[PDB]
Design a protein around this ligand. Sequence first.
Ligand SMILES: [Zn+2]
Lengths: 27, 67, 77, 112, 19, 58, 39
Amino acid sequence: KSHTLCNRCGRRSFHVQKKTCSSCGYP
Amino acid sequence: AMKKVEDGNILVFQVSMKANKYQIKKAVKELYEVDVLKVNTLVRPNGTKKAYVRLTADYDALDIANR
Amino acid sequence: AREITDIKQFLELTRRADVKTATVKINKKLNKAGKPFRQTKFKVRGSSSLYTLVINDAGKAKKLIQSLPPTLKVNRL
Amino acid sequence: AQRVTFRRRNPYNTRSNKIKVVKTPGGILRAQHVKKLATRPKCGDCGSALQGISTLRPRQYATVSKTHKTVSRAYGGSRCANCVKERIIRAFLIEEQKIVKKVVKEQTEAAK
Amino acid sequence: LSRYVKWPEYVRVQRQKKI
Amino acid sequence: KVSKSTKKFQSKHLKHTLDQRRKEKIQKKRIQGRRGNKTDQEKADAAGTREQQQLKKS
Amino acid sequence: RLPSQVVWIRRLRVLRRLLAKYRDAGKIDKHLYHVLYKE
RNA sequence: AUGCCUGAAUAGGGUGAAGCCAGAGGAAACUCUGGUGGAGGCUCGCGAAUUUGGGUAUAGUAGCAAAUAUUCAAAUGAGAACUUUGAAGACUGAAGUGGGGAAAGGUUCCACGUCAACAGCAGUUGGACGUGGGUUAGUCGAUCCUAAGAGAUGGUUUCAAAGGCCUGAUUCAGGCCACCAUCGAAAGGGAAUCCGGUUAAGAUUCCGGAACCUGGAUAUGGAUUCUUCACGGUAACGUAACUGAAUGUGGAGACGUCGGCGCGAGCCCUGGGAGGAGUUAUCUUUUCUUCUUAACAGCUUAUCACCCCGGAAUUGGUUUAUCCGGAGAUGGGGUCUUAUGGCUGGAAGAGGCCAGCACCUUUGCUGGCUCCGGUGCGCUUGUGACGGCCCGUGAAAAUCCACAGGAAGGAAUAGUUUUCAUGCCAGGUCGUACUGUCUCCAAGGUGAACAGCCUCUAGUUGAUAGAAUCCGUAACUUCGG
RNA sequence: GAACGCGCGAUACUCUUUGAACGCACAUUGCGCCCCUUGGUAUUCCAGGGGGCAAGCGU
Ligand SMILES: [Zn+2]
């Protein structure tokens, strides 16, 4: 469960600990 | 829902997801010309909002349903 | 709920403008002497509480029944 | 011999949620959550429990009259009787010592 | 303490240039 | 009758507690026969005071 | 059955109760009562 | 490897350290005997190791996917070892194969229809397929607050012009104050809801009854007693009220762990009686089961602590535990907190257990009883006064209250205040169905040595199938009066 | 570009929630301030609608 939904792109790539997206870089 | 209408004096409606209890009470009062005692809202799994509107004892819910 | 002991307070409560009905409840129960008796509870609710007057005397209860307003709905038991 | 459990969201045996077991008018055992006990107000000088002041939760003091949370004496409701007595005696003696010291200074500077 | 707050930076600079 | 806390401890913590106790016993037995394990007070006694050290030098 | 502490507590409590009752009744004065208390 | 914040757990048996009490020896010091008390690098089931949640830093062959035990009759169905009902046998045995939760999953919950595929045989079954139904909150959580830490502004308050308030016959002048956004806990802090009933599937949410919390505007009664912010008691303190600015403080929130003692409630045990069920070849006043009282509200109720009198060695009081007294003991008389019990309202009208009378049907009507007690090295839980040890005097903030202070205001056809009483109105958004690495509840009998064996309530019958200490003595020995 | 809905956006075969994304936060459909207006007894309360908020003593 290291990743969650990203608001900007909709993928399961939002790292919960880092608070950054590994697919689109949000934010 | 029709059982609730017949017995509990409760009209069951589907409402928008952007409406609160104040707006539902006001809308029922304006559209159907009845006095609302209470409003209880829930959010259904399919993304829609259901409201139970219990009217005051001065009004019969079945009469409004037939109307 | 609240318990009252004053009969005239009960009558004043039953004389208010916004009063729906009054309940008269009968209970058959024993006293400390063992002789059974009839106890009458007069219950009427005010604004936010239910006041109960308990009367263990049959005659006093009958007089209170007679003294109730004729326009007051009375629930027997 | 009926088993009961919590009635709220918390499933852990924390201080916040504590359970008592009561027999309801239905003839069954059921759980009930108990609130935290109130603490007696304490004196601001010695820390002893204040006498004559009701013990309530912090927000329950806002709904009771002033006689239930004060004492008619000075500092009543904040300090106890003995502390007030010591304060009075100490203040008076300090004032007397100030007067005596001022007289002594006046005398010792009066030589010149 | 730190009383320097009584003078804003521009006032302090324009008085320093005076000296 | 066994108490509730005893039941919970024996079901949860008994095994690892016993294992740790055995490990401490084994380590103590192994270190007892070795040389070079002395407490701070024992080492302080062995070194001695400044006067004792100056006497030992002399 | 009953452990040592429970029976000791009961014995000491009943002995002290009897001593206090006897002193209050006047059968024993302060000093004999004080000796019997420690004994 | 070392941390830090906030929770859960840190149990049990044995042994018996200081200190204390009473005896015996000696001039003391000191040594023995018994009890008490209940401690630890005590035991039992340079190096290794040292519970846990959340948060946060440095070939039609092998073989049947293994978790035991099934049998008889009936029903449904084209078809039954596998579906359904009844009977029999067996299993889990409160540390559950029992009832809930956090996280996670996402319709798996319920009904109807179906067996093309899936559930390694079959299936009429389903956590499958198709169509529908289902989750209701002022009171339960989130929402609010801050913790370790993170992070904008000019690295975390720093050489930042970083902001609010008050006074004034109209003159824009004057004055006060200091210090940094924000995020971070569904286990921490926190205002308030209970009982009964109800569905195919929803409940502290719906229904019936009953009650609280917060905020607001206002009216009435009473008080504010000569007209202007009330009294009583030596005192602790009591009260239906009984104004209070700047400013300065105090309390609750709010805080380590262990031990025994006292008290309350739930469970267990148990006597009588009033019902119902089982067994009864013989015996058995016999075995099982019902006899319940919620939140909330009124009256009353306290160990500790404190106050007044009094002035003590012939030293007294006193705890299971040796501490207290001219720094005022013993004794006598009072004050307080309401924790917790008792009575009552809620409330018997509810629920429970019975019996009788109605019908191819929602087919519900009536009548009784729901009472009185005891017991504790028992289990669970809360609480009070103590004692021991470790230690920053043992997280912070939101929030509520109080005290010092004396600014200001108050009277003649409604003076000022309304922490006294009654009365009116309102309470938004999101989660709630179902299951379930951390967590909650927890009966009895035998064991007479934690263990193991058997059962009550409640759940199962799942797994391809068929064939081959104990007998005789004596002294003693418990509570009161 | 994404999410949710009927090529399109509640006017859905005008333009919802977002996104450089802009009132503040954000893994919450969470929390504010300002102006106008309307309704429910209404000067106070509650709610609905519309529109917004990324001086110096130097000369
Ligand atoms: Zn004090």
